[PDB]
Symmetry: D2
Amino acid sequence: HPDISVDVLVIGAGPTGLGAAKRLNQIDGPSWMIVDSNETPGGLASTDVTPEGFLYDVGGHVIFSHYKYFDDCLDEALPKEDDWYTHQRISYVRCQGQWVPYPFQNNISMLPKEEQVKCIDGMIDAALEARVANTKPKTFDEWIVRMMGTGIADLFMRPYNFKVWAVPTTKMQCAWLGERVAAPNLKAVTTNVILGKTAGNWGPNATFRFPARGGTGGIWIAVANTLPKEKTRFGEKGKVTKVNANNKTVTLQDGTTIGYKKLVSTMAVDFLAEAMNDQELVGLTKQLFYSSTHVIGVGVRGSRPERIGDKCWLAFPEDNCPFYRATIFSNYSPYNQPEASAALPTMQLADGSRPQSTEAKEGPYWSIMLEVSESSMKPVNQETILADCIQGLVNTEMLKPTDEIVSTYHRRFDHGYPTPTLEREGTLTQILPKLQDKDIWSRGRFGSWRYEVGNQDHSFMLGVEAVDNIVNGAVELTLNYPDFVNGRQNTERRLVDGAQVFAKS
Amino acid sequence: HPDISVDVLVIGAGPTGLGAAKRLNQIDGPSWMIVDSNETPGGLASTDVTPEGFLYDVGGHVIFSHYKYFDDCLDEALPKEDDWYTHQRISYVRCQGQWVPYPFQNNISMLPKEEQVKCIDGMIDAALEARVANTKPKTFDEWIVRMMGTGIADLFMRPYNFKVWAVPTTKMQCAWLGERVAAPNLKAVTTNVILGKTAGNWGPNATFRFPARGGTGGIWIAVANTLPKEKTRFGEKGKVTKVNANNKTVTLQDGTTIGYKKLVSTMAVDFLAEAMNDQELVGLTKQLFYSSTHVIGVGVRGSRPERIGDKCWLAFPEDNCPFYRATIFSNYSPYNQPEASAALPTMQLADGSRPQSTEAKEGPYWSIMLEVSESSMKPVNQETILADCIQGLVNTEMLKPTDEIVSTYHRRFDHGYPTPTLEREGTLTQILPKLQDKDIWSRGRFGSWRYEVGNQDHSFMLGVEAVDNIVNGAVELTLNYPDFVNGRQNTERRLVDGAQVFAKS
Amino acid sequence: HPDISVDVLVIGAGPTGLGAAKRLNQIDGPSWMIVDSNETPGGLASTDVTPEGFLYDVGGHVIFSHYKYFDDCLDEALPKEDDWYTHQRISYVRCQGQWVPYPFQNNISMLPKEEQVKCIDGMIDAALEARVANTKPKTFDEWIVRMMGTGIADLFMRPYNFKVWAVPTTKMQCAWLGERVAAPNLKAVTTNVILGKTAGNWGPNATFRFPARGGTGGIWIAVANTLPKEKTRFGEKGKVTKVNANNKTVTLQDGTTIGYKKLVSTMAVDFLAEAMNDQELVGLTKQLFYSSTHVIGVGVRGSRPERIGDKCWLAFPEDNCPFYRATIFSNYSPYNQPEASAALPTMQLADGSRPQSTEAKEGPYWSIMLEVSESSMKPVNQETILADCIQGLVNTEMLKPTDEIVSTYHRRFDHGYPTPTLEREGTLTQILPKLQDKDIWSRGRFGSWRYEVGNQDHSFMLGVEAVDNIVNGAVELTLNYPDFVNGRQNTERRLVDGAQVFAKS
Amino acid sequence: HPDISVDVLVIGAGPTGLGAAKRLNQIDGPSWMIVDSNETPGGLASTDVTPEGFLYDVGGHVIFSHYKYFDDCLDEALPKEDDWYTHQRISYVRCQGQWVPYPFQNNISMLPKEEQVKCIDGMIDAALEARVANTKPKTFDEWIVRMMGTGIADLFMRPYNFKVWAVPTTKMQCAWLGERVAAPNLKAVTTNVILGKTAGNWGPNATFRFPARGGTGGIWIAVANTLPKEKTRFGEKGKVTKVNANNKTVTLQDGTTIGYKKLVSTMAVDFLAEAMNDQELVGLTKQLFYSSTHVIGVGVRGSRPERIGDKCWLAFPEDNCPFYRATIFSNYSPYNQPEASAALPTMQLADGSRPQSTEAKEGPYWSIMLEVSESSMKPVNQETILADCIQGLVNTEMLKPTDEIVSTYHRRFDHGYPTPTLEREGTLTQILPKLQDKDIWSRGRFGSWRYEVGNQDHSFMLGVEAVDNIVNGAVELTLNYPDFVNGRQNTERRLVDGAQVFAKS
């Protein structure tokens, strides 16, 4: 006899868990409950704030929704027109003193001519190989070089992805990138070079909306608030410490035990295996690879410098900086940093100098959010990484030596990226089925470990589709067919389906 | 106010409509009702009997299920082990006086060696061209030649498919055939030719089950039987004559009006448009192409001849018979024809002459079922078609001139096959969305006109999935993604889902 | 019995005939002589002079020597260092107001960026096609597009070659172009586009030498001069009017009969068939195709304009002028036009106006030589072609409207170019062996009709090798293997061979 | 001041040297002399005879002539039709108990079926690669696999050519094999397999003629006897022991010195280097590679066994015998072995037994000529090679254990094959130009070291073409352009050219 019993138990109130709970709440048939060890929902889509009042997401978080369901829930949670700000998807690659518009290969006219000649020769080779190709690429590296050619590969995607994944490109699968043939568009690349043209992959219709307040985490707080309070349990009181798969019982930190018939676990699957004391599953989940994510934030005094402008996020293939991505987070919402009348002392100059004065002076302020990856193949000195990042900002000309830093943030997230290693699927197809057999739907960015469906919308839907499978016999498409859900706008499943309509009648 | 009002109205009680009925019945949420102009459910999956006691399906009907849900309803309708007979999927291609095992190209070692050279030379060209191919084939014909080469194409798939579809291969699309690359397996084909080897694509793991009694129609009668009778209206009283899509009112032949919220229509969509008196839709649907099927049944006196043996169905590329397929229907079940003891007179010899005796004599009996197709491009003489079929049975040596025919059958089904013409999708993407904008789900063999998802299981699931889209927001996978449902085991959806389990508390 | 008897008779005393005569003379075995209807040897390699003292060759003649033998005779004919001037092989294509250095495709960076894009895109298609090509091209046109791509083909080689050959490129074979695979050097073309590089195919090591005096005609006058006079018969006295192959008898216009053992005929082979009164051969020779050449010469007052500079010959694909080639003939030798002190009146300005003043003014002078083709598919209006050419020089900015023309030249040459039509080889293979079997060696530009071996050195060597075959069993490499002789330095055969050295002992 | 002085000196009276002489004699201009260390001309084209009366060439010699000149000299030497026998070019490959008709790949239907499958699969791979090939093979081995596919390659050409060349196929170049594309005729191979055809590449047109008497050597004795005797010095008196390049003087065994103006040396070029005492040259010629040849001859008692029949020569890829080639020498001429009434004792039976009787018995007789290769990569035990060859004959079912042997022959020829190693051209293009600079035409099978022009006719013509270069400036086509001479009928150079016709007038 456990203290609580429900039909379906959801561990975790990240996007994936909140999805489950939303669908469960919409269906309102089987009983359910959601728990989380954090008092605040959001998981890796949470947001911190520095004591100086600079918000930081867990690194660059831009929403692109493949599902009208996701949209419905965001619209419900933040329904007002100024709950959101709309921006173009403006991104660039830092290469050889230049801000190269994404996509890199369409903009190498900004590079020295001698370099363009190397790139184009490289891609000519790739086009001619691609014309007679009858195998699929087996690694991320093959995919890159087949798609880009050697010169362009070496300039960007190759060193960039090591910096991103903290594993070399030769060690990753490439199926996760979808069905597009690994072949170059040689005409597009040569055309822009010939025309001396630059062109980004954004415009009036390639946008994203970002929450006005609270950062990305404001979304998930608001979504969570729509759920019936009593069916939630967040904080130390919601910490799962034991899962008895055989007895279908979960134990919490405070000794409270929960009976379930179906388990949706959105905690990391290596953690769940531990919570199960399933030795075999601990072995299997230890074979999975992941990188850790250091997020570093810098609050800078002054209005937005011309050189920064409308830039949103930025990729960094070169090694004069430790970060792989920078976000101009102050561009996402004016409320991601203090108002210009907020007085802050300067903490340091970007070159590391003490400020001439320690007096609190006003803004306006802008803000840079950096990401650094860590793994057993790429260590990160936690003591010096902030300074390395700030030096990185100077080296990349994001900051002048004189720019005034007024806030710093550094947090290290254990599970950051789940890595599409060559061995991933071989391992996941041993883990997920055994959990399934015990009526455990383990889902999410580290629930099911599949990056290609690891964004907020994917996660959210992984939870929804897990619930729909449990209840309505629906296919878990996001889980098992990433190319399908990413290749279409999923419009059928809505926050109001015909069931709720016919029922109110 | 209309006579009857339901949330969901289902028109038609062939496999599709029944699928919709069974899903509505299972969900047991929205009120629903199903109508049909025939007293007997089944549509083109029904079974006729001659006055002499020989059953015939609407042509060769062999179940291969892609879906667990479908299996669930069949198991439910016919739960006993002796409700079913299991057979191996044994088929042959009649070619140049010989029975060649399917797949044809793996068995051309039966042909004369000179012919084998031509065949292999053809496939060598196709192999060599496949190796540098950078375009998808645009027609059924292009597809066929790329797969097989000229020689093999001309021997079998070209003339056979004309005899099947009553249109030239050059007039059909090939996308309906799936995502498999149009390229020959040269090695397999040459290998069997070198080894002088024949090999069928059947065996103990490639089987089908057939109803013990009542033909294929018996399935659907039994599936209907599990529905609540009051929600069914089958016969003259159930014939739809008028659909008013703006009123969401249907009018039956006997004057009965049924008001609906959502319509699942499984009648031929060109008929639906007429019933709607929607001239725009009439014009659109008139642009679709279909063949008619003539079904010819022949009952023969005698134990099953050795030349026939365990043969199930048979393909006929050649001109010496008008039918494209023959089914040894007496192999599918002993109850498809009378017991040996039944006394029946001989109607005629297979060579068309009068029998030596007018007297009723005993069996055993066997039975052959034939399909002749017909279209505007392939007229059929309806007056000579029976004798032409029988003569064809003699020409192909399925019947000896002296064989005694004790029963004959001929029926013409106007909508037999929805033709994958080059124009089909262009027309359908005008029709199907325009109907769904009026909350009409037009689904099924001629409801949505897609042969590639046009078997009994497909149809059934088009009904099920239509309902699941209407009620639960499910993706209509079978409708819009034939390659997807056909390329997997569709296991998630069951006759008992978690919903029904959690409910029963 | 004939008036004259020799072992080997040579008809014609252009380069081919003189070649024969030179080798016969060197060998000094078989008796021989040479006739020509012209009192001045040289054929199409002769030179005219206007009454005003401007020299014109039969269009642009630039020697590239594939053979040492040819060099030896040229050296012997004109031994003095100052019998020659050396120039680099400088040449341009006129296109869109620009002088584009040859090779055209390596220099399209002078064209507008939008033209460049078109050019590269075309070449990218051709490169991709070449990667999977497994057929040789069949026509000149196919060859061109495979080498260059559409855009580049259309800018230069297609319309240029129509203006050259007076037949469309589609009507010509392409084997005459050599054995190089028809594929683009896409990398070289893009690289020069990217770098904004121009690069002409000339320099210190790509030169030609030109007679200091008498034009190209000076060469052959001086070569003929080394022959023993008594074995020549040049002028009216040497015109061949009848050839009796069966009798091995040639008749001259003055009644002189010459019996021969072997005939080397270098006259146009259609002319030979008429002289043979051989209706079969006349029939075959009429199936050959040739164009006529209009040579236009323009003498111009003034020191050589800077816009002209050291230009040698120039190509004109465009239809703003009738000529296909212009030669700055005054660059070849200072004695191709009068000294600066020579006094000439202005005949007309380039704009076509004739000035009132007959005042003879001094020089210096420069000189343009132009070529316009004519054929049955390309009529030339002889009455206006001079004025059209001159307007062409103004259209192409070679002449200012105000430039003063002091001399004009125009002459039509019936047989100008032997055309590499599709049918050429088929026809020649009937003609040349038939003549062979009669001991007639028909050789030379129109003797054997092969442009690819139709230059002065080739022609000369066709004579030499015909004699060497006749006397010494030598292979006629130049005749039957143009690729072989053009792909090597032919150094083995000299004006002094061992035979002569050993004999002088 | 030398003992004798000539214009041209020929060292060697093998085919190459005799060619030079024959041409020198024909021209009858420059003075000349020919020497050889052997009293009997022929070199490796000579014929030995055993004490028992069995003739043996230096292994299988079969004439295929690319030249009319060669034919002329042969016809002159042996003019009666009685002097020659004509035979169809009948050869087989010994493979797994079968005699497989050349060409091997067109006849694998004699092999087990399972193996035909391996072969065809392998060649199918090759055809698919060839369709997309963009590079020429770099080695003999790459050439073989690209032509034949793996399986066919392993069965024959790979193991065979190591047995022929005594170097692995990976060590040799492939240009020597000519300009044909390295690609399979897939349809020809599959066609014969399907049809079960065993088709030989010989017929009433594919013939060779072989001398009636004296074997191959009889040819060259007869050609030599046409030379003015006094200009020949053959035997110990004609042995060259010294070549002083700078004095243009040769010194003979007895002391006789000869001054030349030009030298044609047909001795092996490593021997020439030595005779020149040129250090640099010796170094270079030592870097050339060559295989030695062991010729084994077996005289057998009895009429030609049925199993042998009309076989001419036979190739042996397999490891159960040491020879690469057998020749049924008794098939070439009835005079290659004693007449039937010739009495001979049996030396041994083929299994090695002593014969039952020691007395001489009559014939008739037949005869087998075997070839074994030797090199630093493939030693040959000279003491046992005869016995191993005889065992080979039993192993290959060429001889029964009971077959009686009445003669044995073994002889080792040091310079056997000049090897087309990868390094061959690098070395030769460093040697021949230096000899050329000293007025030394080093020519022939080991004079110029090129197997692809290393047959009797090539060798002859190498000598002829060297003379014609020396005297008449002729191109040395056979020397520098093997693909050219071999790809054509060389008919222009005759034993009586025009020069000799015109001189007798």
